[PDB]
Amino acid sequence: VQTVTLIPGDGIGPEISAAVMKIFDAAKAPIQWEERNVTAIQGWMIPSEAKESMDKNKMGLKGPLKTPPSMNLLLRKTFDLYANVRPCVSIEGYKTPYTDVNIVTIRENTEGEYSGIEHVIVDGVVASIKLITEGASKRIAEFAFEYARNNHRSNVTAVHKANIMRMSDGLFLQKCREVAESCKDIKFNEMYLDTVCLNMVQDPSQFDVLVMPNLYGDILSDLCAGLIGGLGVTPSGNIGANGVAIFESVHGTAPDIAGKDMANPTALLLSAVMMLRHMGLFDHAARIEAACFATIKDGKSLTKDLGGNAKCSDFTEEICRRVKD
Amino acid sequence: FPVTMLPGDGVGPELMHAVKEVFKAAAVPVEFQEHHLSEVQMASEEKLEQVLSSMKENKVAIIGKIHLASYDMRLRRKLDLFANVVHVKSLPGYMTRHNNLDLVIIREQTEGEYSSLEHESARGVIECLKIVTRAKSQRIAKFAFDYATKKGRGKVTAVHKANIMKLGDGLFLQCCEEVAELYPKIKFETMIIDNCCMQLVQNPYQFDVLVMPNLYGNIIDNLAAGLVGGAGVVPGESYSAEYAVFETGARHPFAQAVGRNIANPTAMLLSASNMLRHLNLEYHSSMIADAVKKVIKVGKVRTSDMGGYATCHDFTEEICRRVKDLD
Ligand SMILES: Nc1ncnc2c1ncn2[C@@H]1O[C@H](COP(=O)(O)OP(=O)(O)O)[C@@H](O)[C@H]1O
Ligand SMILES: [Mg+2]
């Protein structure tokens, strides 16, 4: 029996956290929850009991947070969350114009145009500082190639703009190329960001694992989520230092429907599935994931946002009786 | 009517060949004067001046992709082509997952990350400067709103990442928010590039005109082009206060296809048609565009990118015989 740090969050957060809790218990998952609140205090940092919890449990599940220093930039520095993994998978029986999408975006989470560094050079002239380093690049590329080796993926594509930003993106590319030479069992290729965006929208099936710097990853992960149904069905995990990883929903707090038993908890649940696989609980992950997809394929009980009108409770309840197989 | 031509990189020369052939068959009173900037060696600043000089005389160009800052950024500063407009429009017979789509993408093209401002700050740590200025953000915002005023458009959307680049992208938004107040009959919305890219895939019909800085324009140009058929069919144009140069919307050399008579010239042809509109040869403009559009709708002759088997030359001549069938 193992303990997970749970940050319910704001708006629908509690509801969808509780929904994931009930599904885990129904599935007899060996998971207990330590509920924690990360609204920042200053001395800016997260509350001591949050950090102490996460340092001890390593696994965290995090719902949508409200935007005020952002608590997610704080979480990232506090645990050196350097790898943002976002699998994008077609949901069998939730029709979009795109089918058989199976892409994993690996996004460098520490650097790039997200440095926080800008200057007013002279009045009316701003320079924003994009930062690319040798170590961060090698680290993310080593992560994308380990992920491909451990998840049956065959191809890693490095997405870049080294033709426009010759030195920074060039360095990112060079460190990908090095790691790729070190991993002969994964086929590696390079591709410009604009070209990826041009092709992704036409034929998404030509892409497997994609590793890229921060800004490109933040943008392309959300583009790809459009192909399969939006942020309400997309999981996300962030890996960090000292075996810490935080799995998260990346949709908004949805206050227009908070508390009205109307929320869609697929995302947090599919993230909690990533979490379960990260912990070795492969059998519970596959049953919960199977129970989830089967509920959606059946159609008879979808939440408002996916073209139905079942309550969040009814959707959560059908999954629970399904996962008892 | 003299017109500066720059064949450009990759399949560029092949595409100009198709423009040149269709123009002959439509008896377009246009005389191209050819110059070369793409892939030159010290002969750099010289060739750029010959373009500016012929541009002062012709004030209108049609160019392929053009392969210290890059040759493209240098040309665009030398000519002050701050504004780039891509018309994202479905072709009635050419079916995709998003038909009946009509968007305009306006991108600032002289600053941002395209400045080549990079340096090694320490062993293995590279710094790269994205530039945003008040003067260029204001100017591209006025252009977008004058565009949407002129062409009868309703909404202008400013795309940004000011939640992260609060100073630089913030100053871009600020100039947009200022200009928007002068055009009260135009709706003004803002949206983070992250979401905007998801929005364009789920439901691009929610948009109308979009305006944005350089890098986000390169992304959205390509994304939106792929919605309506890809780089073979989507045209573009770049403006100064006195110049207009026409090009393709999602700019790519297509190195693979050079010499294989494979490339689709629809984008370059439609662009040439908009060029003719800019020259007050409306009759020739609407004829070429109507012929291009009808050969695609009918479905007999179509290049690989559009589901067919035809060569670039086969497709071009099908256009030529159709235009000659109108005069
Ligand atoms: N004129 C054209 N006709 C048809 N397809 C085109 C044309 N230009 C570009 N494309 C499509 O767009 C892609 C452009 O990307 P490409 O030229 O390979 O360069 P990059 O190195 O920028 O990715 C091509 O692979 C091709 O599929
Ligand atoms: Mg994002």
Residue numbers in the entry:
A (entry chain A): 4 to 46, 51 to 75, 81 to 337
B (entry chain B): 15 to 55, 57 to 82, 91 to 350
Please give sentences taken from the publication describing this entry.
Human NAD-dependent isocitrate dehydrogenase or IDH3 (HsIDH3) catalyzes the decarboxylation of isocitrate into α-ketoglutarate in the tricarboxylic acid cycle. It consists of three types of subunits (α, β, and γ) and exists and functions as the (αβαγ)2 heterooctamer. HsIDH3 is regulated allosterically and/or competitively by numerous metabolites including CIT, ADP, ATP, and NADH. In this work, we report the crystal structures of the αβ and αγ heterodimers and the (αβαγ)2 heterooctamer containing an α-Q139A mutation in the clasp domain, which renders all the heterodimers and the heterooctamer constitutively active in the absence of activators.
Crystals of αMMgβADP belong to space group I422, and the asymmetry unit contains one αMβ heterodimer, which forms an (αMβ)2 heterotetramer with a crystallographic 2-fold axis-related heterodimer. In this structure, there is an Mg2+ ion bound at the active site in the α subunit and an ADP bound at the pseudo-allosteric site in the β subunit, which are well defined in the electron density map. In the αβ, αMβ, and αMMgβADP structures, the active site assumes an “open” conformation due to the absence of substrate and/or cofactor. Intriguingly, in this study, we found that there is an ADP bound at the pseudo-allosteric site with clearly defined electron density in the αMMgβADP structure, and there is an NAD bound at the pseudo-allosteric site albeit only the ADP-ribose moiety is well defined while the nicotinamide moiety is poor defined in the electron density map in the αMICT+Ca+NADβNAD structure. The binding of ADP/NAD at the pseudo-allosteric site causes substantial conformational changes of the sidechains of His275B and Phe277B, which induce the β12B-α8B loop to adopt a conformation similar to that of the β12G-α8G loop in the WT αγ heterodimer. In the αMMgβADP and αMICT+Ca+NADβNAD structures, ADP or NAD form hydrogen bonds with His275B, Phe277B, Ala278B, and Asn287B (corresponding to Asn273G, Gly275G, Lys276G, and Asn287G) in the β12B-α8B loop and Thr207A from the α small domain. Besides, the sidechain of Phe277B makes a π-π interaction with the adenine moiety of the ligand, which further stabilizes the ligand binding. The ADP binding at the pseudo-allosteric site may in turn stabilize the active conformation of the αβ-αβ interface and the active site, which may explain our biochemical data showing that the addition of activators has a weak activation effect (1.7-fold) for the αMβ heterodimer but not for the WT αβ heterodimer.
